[PDB]
Structure formats: C-alpha cells, structure tokens
Subunit: 428 residues, 4 copies
C-alpha cells in the first residue's frame, strides 16, 4: 500500500487496506449512493468547511472512487489522485486548475485528436486559454514558446498516433526554470513508464484505455506528484484565500496536495465531471492485471512490427524505436520496459488500399478506442483526427495513408494471420 | 413513445420501442462499453463527420443513455435531450453552449448553493462569464439586468430552498423580446410541472433527485424544446460553420435540435462530462414510477406542513402555498399537481435548537440530498449553502435558523412521529 | 424496521437502519464480493460452527442480500427470510427443507406451469417426493389427500392463471390439525395479501415479478412466519442433532427461526441456489415502490376486465371476482386491497383468433413474465404451461383458447386502445 | 472463436463474434432483463417446445450468460457449457442430470469440504444418491467400488487441500470400460490443465475462483465434452422420450450436446439455480486475463514453497510435486504448465501456533476463498472442512495443524515478507 511495496502488491491492496470495517468485504464494494448520513450537525459543518475529511456527496467524493484514486496515487507514487468522468475531463481539469482566460499553455504536437481540438478550439472558445503548439521533438521549441502567461508544459508520453517520445528531463528542466509545471499524459504507457521519475509534476490518464483494459468504461484520472512549488506568484489561486471556502489556502491547508485538492473542491464540485462508483469498480479490477497485460501488449507489438516490415503490401512501419523515427533515441532512453502497443503503417495504394485492408479484417476490431485487450485498427485521418485540418494532422503525425493498430493480447499468430489475409486482399 | 400516449405509458416505453432487435430484451440493456464496431471504413467516416447518426464512443453517446435521453425528451415534449455526469455539469453545459468569456447571464436568486457558487465564482474564474443575480420575484428585475452581452435567462422552478416560484410566462416574454432563451432548472418538480408549456426553451435536471428517486446515482439532463430561434446573431456558434467539424452548421444540419446537438458534438466530446450507462439504467427505472412517487411526495408534504404549523416548538413553516410565501400567487398559478416535497421550518430557540432537532432524529436521515424516497433533513446555512456569505444566503432564501425537509414516501404517521419526538427534545 | 412502523416505512428502512457504519452510505451498497476478512482464527471458527452470526461467504450470505431478506421479513412480519436464485429455487428449497425421498406433498392444482412440472416430474425423479394434486376449491379435498407421509400443504394465493383463490384459513386448519405447515406462493399478491394473517406458515415469492416490478432480475424469496411447531416428530431434521454441524439442533439454537435457518445452512450452502448482490440491490429498489405499483396494477386490471366484458370480439373474461369464478367468494373475503393484475380472456374464433390477437399487439408486449410495469400478454397453453398434458392444463385452469394478460401501470387508455385494435384484427 | 485460434484469442472473442448486431457494442452488454419479446405466436410456441433455439426467460438462458457459456466451451473445446448460480450448483446439477434416488457415484476423497458435505449428507438425504468415497491415489479403488448402480466417477484435478493428483487416464479407462463418464472438478486448474485431453467427459468449475480471479462473484460452470455415448442403457433420461417436453429425446434432438442440453431444459428450468447476467459479465472479464494470472499464480507458489521449506518455524510443506506427496508422479505427468497456486504447511507448535500465525498476518487475507488475485490463508480444519469428522478430514488430506495458502499475484517479495514476520511471531 505504501512506497515500500511492489507495484503489483500495491495494485492489489493500496487504498483498501484494511477492508471496509463494517462487514470486512474483501472486494471493493460498489457504493452506488449519492449521500451519506452525518454523525451530527457539527460533523456535517466540519465536513462542508474542509475542517475534517470524510464523505459528503458522490459528486465530490465516494468510497469506491476513493479506492481507485488512492491506488493510482500509490502506483504513481504521487501525493494524491482524482478520478473524473473521462480522459477529456481529466485533461480539461488539469489545465483549468492552474489556467484561466488570457493564460497560455505550451503543448507538444504529437497529440490525440480530441486533445488537440480541446486545446485549439474548445478551451479557447470557452475558457479563453491560448495553447501554443510546438514541435516538442526539439526541447528548444518548448523554451522559445514560453512567455510570462504560460502556466504549464504539456506532453504525451508516446504521441497518439505520432509515436514520438519527447525528452522529458530536458523539457522538465526548461519548464521548472521558467516556474511552470510539466504535465504528462501517460494514457498509453501506465506501469511501463513512470513520468514523475523523469521531471513530470502532474500526470493525467485516460483510464478508459490500458488502465481499464477491457473497453467497458469511460474514465479519467489526475495524479499530483506533490513535487511542484506553487508559491512563485504564477498560481495565486493555490495560495491566496479562497472566497468560496471562506479563506482556505490550498498550500497552507493541503501542503503538498494543494493542486489535487483544488481539483476536487473547486472544479469537480462546480463543473461536475464525476465518475460513477460502478465505473470506478471496473477500473479497480483493471489495475489488478495491468502489469501482466502491458508486458503482453508490448511483447506482441514488437512482433507485429517485425511482421509488417517484411510484408510486400506494407509501404512503411512506425514504432517508437523504428529506424526512421525522429525520436528513436528518446524512446531507447526513457522506455526501458516496453515501447507501447500502438503500431502504425501504410499500405501500398495509399488511402484507398488501406480501406480495403480495414474492411477485410475478420478478427481485429474496427472501432474508436485504444488499450483494449482486443487488437484494434482504425484510419485516424477520417476518425480520431478528422476534426483537424490536413496540416494539423501532419503536425500530430497523422498521414492520409496511416493505419493505426492497437495490438492486443490475443495469441500473436492469430493477430498476424488476420493482418496477412487482409493485406493480401488490400492489393486486389 | 409519441405525443399521443399518456405520461405513464411514455415513462414505460418511450425511447425503447421496439426492444433491441438482436435479442428482444424487454428491459433496457446496460451497454457498459466504450466503443462500437463500424460496418466499414465509409461508415466510420460518415459517423465521425456527422453525416449519418449512430454510435461512435461512449463519451459522446451510448445506447442505454440514448433511451434515457429519448424518454426524458418524450416526457418533456422536447426535440432531444442530453445526459451528463451530474446536475452541475448539465448547468455548466447549458450555459457554455451559448456563452463564453465576456458574455453575461441573468439568473434568478433562489438558487441551490452549488449553482450559485458556479455562477458567482467558478464560471467567472474559468470561463470569464459574468452572471447577474437579480430578484426574480418581480419580473421587472429580469428586464432591467439584460444587456447586449446577455446570452440567456436562468431560473429554478421552485427555489432550493427558498421555495419561491418565478413568473415563468412573464419572464419568458422578457427574455424572448430581448432575443435570449429561458433556461429552467426543473430538478425539484419533474412530472408535476412542465416548463416548456410556460415559456421555457431549455430545461435542465439534476436526475440525481426525484427522477432517480432512490438516492443511488448522480446524473444530469439537458432538454431542448426546439422552440428557440438561434439565428438572431447572438449565437454564431450555432449558425456559422464549425471549424472543428469542417463547416457543419448546427441550425442547418440539425434544424430544431441545433442547441442540444452542439451540447454533444462540442461540449460533451471535448469537456467530457459523460454519464455512465449503469447510472442511466437506474434513472430509467426511476422514471417508471416517477408519477406515483411525486403524488405521494406532495401528498405527504401537505400533511407535514399542517402538522408543523400546529406544533408548539415550531417558529415558522414555509411551503410554496404557505400564506406568508412571497410568491404564493405564482405557486397557485403554475403548480396544479402538487407543490413539491421540500418543506422548511424554524424551531423556537433559533439555530441552536434546530441543531438539537437534527441530532434527535431516529428515522429521518441527516444527509445532503433531496428527492429521495426516504425523508431527509439538513441545515442549509452550514451545508448546501455554506459557500455563500451571510447576505448571499439571505438572497437565496436561506436563514440561519432554517431546517430543510425533503418529505419522503414513508407512511406519514411515522414521519410525523419522528418529527414530534425530535421537536420536543429540541426544547430541552 | 419493526412491527410498529407502517408498510411503506418498512419498505424504505427495514433491514438497513442504521446505514452501513463505515461510510454511512444512505443507499444499500452493492457488496459484489465473494469473501470477508475474519477478525481472528477464533472468530472464523465460531462463524463456521454456527456459534456466532456474521458473514462468511457470499454463497451462504451477503450484506446486500441480508437487507432484502430482513426487509422482506419485516413486510411479511416473519422471523426471517432467505433470498435465492429464482422463484423456482425458492419453491424447491421450501419443499426440500422438510421433505425427502418417500415423503408426500399435498398441492393445489391452480399452479404456474413451472411449479406443476417441478412437482409432477422433477421433484419425483430427482428427490423421490410424491406430490398429490387436488382441487383446492373445496378444502375437503385437502383433508382427504393427507397421509402420514405428508410433510406440507402448498397453495398459490391467486392461481396463475386459473385465478382461483383457496380458502386459506379453512385449509390452514386442516394442515395444522394433521401437524403439517401450510406453504403459500404469494408471488402475484405481495403487499395486497398477507398470508401469515390467514394461517400460512411459510411464504415463497418469485421476486422476479411484482416485487422487482421492472422485469430486470430473476430472484426468489422464502419467508418463515416462525409460528409452526417443528417438534411433533414429522420433521426430525429440524430437531435432531445435525451431523454436518456437529450436533446443532435447529429448534434449540434458532428457536422460532429453525426452518429458515436450515434453508441457509443446509440447502443454500450445499445446493447453491444463491442470489447475486446486484440482483438483491434491484429488488430492494423495487420494494420501495411496491405498494404504489400494486395499487395501480389492480386499478388498471379492474378497468381492463370491464372493457373486455363489453368487447364484441371477446368470448369470455375471467378475474378472481368474475361472476363465473368458482372461488369468487374466497376472493371477496381474503382480497380486500385489490384483486391482482392478471386477467384471462378468450377471443371468438378460439385458439386461432387468439394468435391473431397476440400478433397484432403494438404496445402490449408478447413475452414470458408477469408483474412487469409494462402490460404483457401470452398464450399459456403453448408457453408457460406447454409442458403439461391437455388434461393437466385443464386442471390448472388453462384452456386451449386462453389469453393471459398482466395489466401494467401504463395509462389505461393506451392499454385499452392497443387491445381494441388488436381484437378487431383478430376477427378478420 | 474456433479450435484453430489460440487460447488467448478465444478468451477474448469466442462467443461474441460478431458483436451484438443492433449497436455493434464491442463489450458484452449486461442484459439485465427477465424476458424477451417474441416475433409472433408461432415463434413463441417453437421456442417453448424446443423446436427452435432462442431466448425465452433469463432463468433458462440469457444473452450475456450465453457469451460466457460459449467462451468457456470454446476454451475447453467442448460442445457446450451451462452457467449456474455457484460451483456447488454446478456439482449438484452435474450429478442430478444422470443420477437419482438409489443410484451410486464413485468419488475421490481429495475433496473440497462443501463437495464432501454435499456428497455425504445432502445428496443422500434429499436425492437418495449414494456416494462411495475411495482413495483415488490408486486407480484400483475406483474399479473395485463400481457397481451396476454407478452413474459416474468424480475427481478433483488437484485435491483442495490434499494437493493429490489422480491418474486421470487410468481412471477414465476404468470409468469408460464400465460405461460411466468421468467428471472432473477443474476449479483450481483452468487453462493449466485440460481434462478433456485426458479422459474426462464432463468438467465443472467454481467460476468464483480463478476464472473470476478477483473475488467479486459467485458462479459455477458445467462443460460437456460431447464425447460420451449416453445410449448404453444406464442413462434412459437422455435417450427415452421426455414426458415434460412431449416426447423430445435429448440424444436424438441435441446429438452430442444431449447431456448439457438436459441440464438446462430440466435442472436449470425447474430447480432454478440460475446465474445473474451481471455476474456473468464479470466472469467474462476475468477470462480475458486467465492465462496471464495462472502463470503468475504458479510461479509465485513455487517460490513460496521454497521459502516455506527453509523456514525454521515450518514443520512441513506440501505441493503437488513435493517429495512426500503420494501422487508426485501423476502431478509431473499431467501438469506441464504449472502446479497450481494452493500451498499447505504446518507450523511448529501444532494447531496453537498456526492460529497465532494466521492472526499475525498484515497483508495476506484471512478469509474463505481460493484463486483470488490476493494471497489468502485459512485453517481448513475449523473452516472449509469443519463439517467433516476428524476421520473424514484426514481422508481429504486435512490435518489439525494444516494452514492453506492461496498464493496470489502480488510481488513475491512482499508475500514472503508477510509470511516471515507472521511465522516468527507464531513461535512466541
Ligand atoms: C446535495 C445536492 C442538492 N442539490 C443539487 C442540485 C443540483 C446539482 O445536481 P448534482 O450535480 O448534485 O447532480 C442542481 N440543481 C438543483 C436544483 C439541485 O438541488 C441538495 O440536496 O440541496
Ligand atoms: C415466467 C415465469 C412465470 N411465472 C414464474 C412463477 C414462479 C417461478 O418463479 P421464477 O423462477 O420465474 O422466478 C413461481 N411462482 C409463480 C406463481 C410464478 O408465476 C410466468 O410469467 O407465468
Ligand atoms: C469457500 C469456498 C472454497 N471452495 C469452493 C469450491 C467449490 C464450491 O464452489 P462455490 O459454490 O463456492 O462457487 C467447488 N469446488 C471446489 C474445488 C471448491 O474449492 C474454498 O475456499 O476452498
Ligand atoms: C492519449 C489520450 N489522451 C486522452 C484521451 C481522451 O480519453 P477519453 O476517451 O477517456 O475521454 C485519449 C482518447 O483517445 C487518448 O488516447
Ligand atoms: Mg519565461
Ligand atoms: Na467453541
């Protein structure tokens, strides 16, 4: 449960030791409730005033959700975590907790298409936040984009689907020198990469993906390392008395957990992007097998890459350590326990033959998701990144002929068998 | 399912006739999935490009949630509905869909404390929206607050816990004359009041409360009447080509459902406050008995009021048709099928004896919720409205001595008995 | 929770007051767990030895399931209840708990088709129990069938679908004088009839039906009145030391609850017909509206009967108080709060026109169930009672032309409207 | 999905390819319904008469449960499977399908205590079946116990907790030569052992254990290999016309699936030990990681065995391949992919020091279960096998000082640490 225990021990125990005291239930109960009876009038007031911890209302906190949050925090070795309705909500909250109208964010370009559209369109239109996209393959572009309005630097661990890996430590040094935190979306690399150990201050997850692992539940997570000093004047909301809580100071009351505390008391309570206790239950079950699944995902993915490189129908193949990958060196440096499950390739004939490939699949699933146990395929340019212009797609690494694979944990020969027949048919 | 069928028939059938065609399941299945397999590449492209309706990803839409959405729409006689993670998210989305940084909102003052804090602080700090609180008990106050930056007028059906009822028709005329829609929070009066029949253009619900009815699940709903013309120049996002969808015009493509459509394609997709399919399943079950429960709720409330008015320990009692209610006339006009389940009262001895009353309850539950099947009690000044200053509390109708009851559907004799013993103990 | 509180108060509170002590969750949590951590080695031993109550293993007992059991017991005013996988399982356990190879059961003939087949075939072939079916419309037939091997007398409250009602008190007098308990399947009449107030010793329910009320979940319940003396020598398994529990005597240890206690420690533990915690959660929600739904069911049923009596397409109509019903007097005597939701009728043209009626329904659902909120229809001779010979069907009240309705809680005008169009098509 | 695909591919796809056709949901929906709308009167009649397959009623079959059933059958390469409420119910149904009053079963003695109690007491008292327990470590004991009343031979793969492994092939030869099937309880060895490849005809599982893998859900499975000829005269119920289905012959109508078909149409339909769709949903998720979890379970168990053998506090250690194990040879021959997760040992000081060991655990959970992801410990003599006499306990391999471990998938260092500290305290 603590930092002394192994990763798999934590994934099975952290946040729920001892078990619930009334009945001793070994599994995390599904507290499908909105409300909780208070001990007395004074207890209720202390709870609402942030003077005592406890459960008040499922929008703000819930015992099932708390187990997931505390377990994620222990696995990331952070000071606390917060679960929200979706990955999008986690990214939105992570930004909104330290940024507002007029503020800026410096973001990498290897982004999931929904993150780009949020940064490029929705956050500007609705929150007045101005995101400056840069080529994070060169840390200098991060440095040169930072202004006095920048509030954070944002990166994806392995670009979806660019498959580029930024130089985390070099970029973190730059962000901290300018007094801003580094935010890392570790959606595609839980367990196999520890962002906090390489300069990241905040980590967000799409729990929907590898953390859940079974494609059953939408969810998002925010994890606070507690390592960042919020008192440099650039984040007064975390320092100054909060009028909505009659003067509470997050840095004073919550100390290293100031950031993740305000995500709950401010953003979750008012904006209301809360996770269902049922979804949290399913995410907890997913965590219990994460390390086993990631190892298989990455073992199979490497074999898929080798198969695609030698197939006559395949124009090109990309993977974080591919010979042609611009950031191959970073991947070798930072990814010591697998290079991810996402594999991209192009089929001879361009976009048109790719569609024949997708339409010929008999086992691989054509759908919008990643990090399911099943192997998945999709054409990002018309789907996950459809919202972006042709040039914006190129900036994220999406080409008109790109096929995106999420290599699952089937027996790899059956994955390869389905790929081969579909590729041969694609050349007809 | 259609407008020809009764309320209860619709509450049992609308949105799910015929049953799911693969197996014929009479109950609404729980589609606890993230993703859906596409027929082919062209099908996937048409879905993502908004050219054909269908299911893409549970963050954006889901078959279980769709049944809830369509059934609520049928019960409200709207053109469409959208389910979100919570009542707060529904309110946030309802505003953000037609308002942004610099824009203004005219809002009533009888607000749930979380709505007030959202309007007063969070929407300002995070979205730059300026909410103008007014005394909605006199329609003139609405008119005089509207400027050329106003995007909507916002009201609660029966103030939580002010118990004031605004003049819906009069305010709707004012909002429409200035070319802005009326948004009505009908959380506390589903079935028993139809805002669309009295000038409202958008309705939001905390489904958490009476719609669910059993205190199991957090949820929110947005209902679009389809009656409002968005083309007067004040809502360009609904008319002009959307850059994020390569030129789609919401009024052109979706006609009467433009508003609720952008709620989904923009706000739900990017901000990510999605509802769980499991929660929607439970809300659907609640709707099937809603009319029966509301009738019982309101019948018990009338008797509880009579009992409290005659008790020696009770300083005052409020209810929408109480003689002393400032908006008694509006309540008599608009509330023809029950005056709600919420009852407020003061105990001799002020705040101190009130706290003893709460602490002496043995059957009524001391918790934060309304619209549960069980009878509930709380002290709003220190709980639901703690975030507000003393003067803001008075503006919402919360007094330091106020006890709020949510009268449940127990046998009324047992409710009265628990009140009586606790009221007598409060005088010791 | 106690006998002092009203039925609806109990339906909202009994078995879960106070709420679960660890978190105070107002809703009954879903303890989807198999196992429970024991305090110590000695605690575990005392639990397994039946020396102390507690939770051991979900096959045997579960906190969510316990609330349902304790709540059902409070509504029936019994000493205890047991939840099982299905109504069939409840009936199977009720019999096997006091009968074995060579023993006899005296049963009425107005039986659900699955109960008849269990009694006539499966319990004989698999347990050696010999069921003696009699015409329970005359209590004398019960008396004359009892032998020294008889272990119980079994009845349905309102025959499904014979719609006959036995003389409960007269039959109870007969059974008790012969030293055997009366078992009553109250599936179709919860709340509206209390068998314990009219001589019944044990009650079973298909929780699937009206108790759930929404057609989501299969479940069964066994309720023990505690009124029957098991020491007359005809039930030594309930008196003698149990070798499997090292000498425990159920009457000595469990006193009035000896019968329901062995159902759990013996039949549930070894035969394993356990209910899921999730299902119990849903039945608990159903109980909270049971009285409201049953009243509506019965109000609508009376109106449907009158409509069918006047329709030109209808050959005949039956209801417990119909002029031609053999047990109209029993129905008038015992059913003081509604006569049930089941209605049977025949259409001119016999069996062939009946099929045309069923196939012409557009709102009433053609499926196998009763006591759903929706109105249902089926042809028992080919479905629920298909397993029975022609003569056995007649003994249960099923005729070749019989259509069975389960009148739901839609607005009655929509039910009648759908009936009318479908009956007219049946005559074409 | 078919026999050509690997085990893990089948574990991810079999039974749900293609996805449900109405919405294409990639995850298996939770069909939490009781009933299904029929196409027409003739369709309903054909279903109930067993003339066409389809869904009728969740007690008998359900689309979510069917996916679990078909996936288990595909993993076992059997002709079909049936899901029931519990492992106990699976064992009960497997026996009752081919046995009745007066019949005999030849069973091994290395049994779970609940199976022993079912065989020794409940099946005798309630079904008149006479189980003859033998020492299955010598196949001759099976041969010499068979009479003309024998209907099956029953074995556990790895005795719980005897840890003995029978000679499956030798016993299967004896059973088949005498014209009776071999039934194998493979609860503790899914994936790692394939009973059908070694003479077994029927396999039963407690899905509760490793198949679920997370201690969330009670469930049982019956798997039919389809290999056994039921027409040798010893099983007339599977050949002769069935009176309850108006002459249907299971061998004639269902061919290789005769046995598993009658389990459903007779035993499940009438005795009613049905599984919840929600539980089945969770079992499907568990299967997706089964091969991963089983490998880790067995790797850790081998290391735990090594650690216990060298600890000064440990009197003895048992494991399927332990030097002192009577069936070490059988274990080496049949178990080529892991020797299970269950490990037993005794502590110096006998029963008294063992209790101190159990009471000193801080990470390993003291509860009644096996095959959870967490490491578990219990004292079988006072818990799982308490119902057995001292002599019966020894015959199953349970000694007064035996501690049973279910080694989970934590990091093995943390498991050893908790064992070590607890063993040291046991010597004080
Ligand atoms: C404890 C919550 C209470 N009320 C919540 C509420 C909300 C928020 O909805 P949720 O986010 O909680 O789902 C929106 N609108 C109205 C009118 C409300 O009363 C209450 O009992 O005072
Ligand atoms: C679909 C089955 C029907 N009825 C079931 C039933 C049962 C069995 O209970 P379950 O196992 O199905 O839960 C027991 N007793 C009575 C009175 C019943 O009507 C029906 O629609 O006619
Ligand atoms: C407490 C239960 C335990 N075991 C149960 C079990 C069963 C019964 O299955 P269920 O009814 O519990 O699902 C059948 N077969 C075997 C081999 C078993 O080990 C245990 O902890 O040893
Ligand atoms: C890398 C990454 N970040 C964020 C998201 C958004 O996740 P969610 O679907 O849970 O909102 C996704 C979804 O594709 C993703 O892949
Ligand atoms: Mg700078
Ligand atoms: Na003792």
């Amino acid at each position: 449960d603590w930092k002394k225990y192994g990763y798999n021990t934590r994934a099975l125990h952290a946040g729920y030791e001892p078990p619930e005291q009334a009945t001793g239930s070994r599994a995390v109960p599904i507290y499908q409730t909105t409300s909780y009876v208070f001990r007395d009038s004074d207890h209720a007031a202390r709870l609402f005033a942030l003077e005592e911890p406890g459960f008040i209302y499922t929008r703000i906190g819930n015992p099932t959700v708390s187990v997931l949050e505390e377990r994620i925090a222990a696995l990331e070795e952070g000071v606390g975590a917060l679960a929200v309705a979706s990955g999008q909500a986690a990214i939105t909250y992570a930004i909104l907790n330290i940024a507002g109208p007029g503020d800026e964010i410096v973001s990498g370009s290897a982004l999931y298409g929904g993150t780009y559209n949020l940064f490029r369109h929705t956050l500007y239109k609705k929150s007045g936040i101005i995101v400056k996209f840069v080529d994070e393959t060169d840390p200098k572009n991060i440095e040169e984009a930072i202004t006095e309005k920048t509030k954070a630097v944002y990166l994806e661990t392995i670009g979806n689907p660019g498959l580029t890996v930024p130089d985390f430590e070099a970029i973190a040094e730059i962000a901290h020198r300018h007094g801003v935190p580094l935010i890392v979306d570790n959606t595609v690399a839980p367990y196999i990469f520890r962002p906090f150990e390489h300069g990241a201050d905040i980590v967000v997850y799409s729990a929907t993906k590898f953390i859940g692992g079974h494609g059953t539940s939408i969810g998002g997570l925010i994890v606070d390392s507690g390592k960042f000093d919020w008192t440099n004047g650039k984040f007064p909301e975390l320092v100054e008395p909060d009028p909505s809580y009659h003067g509470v100071s997050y840095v004073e009351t919550f100390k290293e957990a100031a950031y993740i505390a305000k995500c709950r008391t401010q953003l979750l309570r008012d904006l209301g992007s809360c996770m269902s206790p049922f979804n949290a239950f399913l995410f907890i079950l997913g965590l219990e097998t994460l390390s086993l699944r990631m190892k298989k995902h990455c073992e199979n993915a490497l074999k898929i890459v080798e198969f695609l490189k030698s197939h006559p129908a395949v124009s090109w193949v990309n993977y974080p350590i591919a010979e042609g990958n611009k950031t191959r060196e970073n991947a070798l440096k930072y990814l010591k326990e697998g290079y991810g499950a996402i594999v991209t390739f192009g089929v001879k004939g361009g976009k048109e033959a790719g569609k024949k490939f997708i339409d010929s699949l008999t086992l691989i699933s054509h759908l919008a998701n990643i990090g399911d146990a099943r192997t998945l395929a999709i054409h990002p340019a018309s789907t996950t990144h459809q919202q972006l212009t042709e040039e914006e797609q190129l900036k994220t690494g999406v080409t008109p002929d790109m096929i995106r694979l999420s290599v699952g944990i089937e027996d790899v020969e059956d994955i390869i068998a389905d790929l081969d027949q579909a590729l041969r048919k694609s050349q007809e």
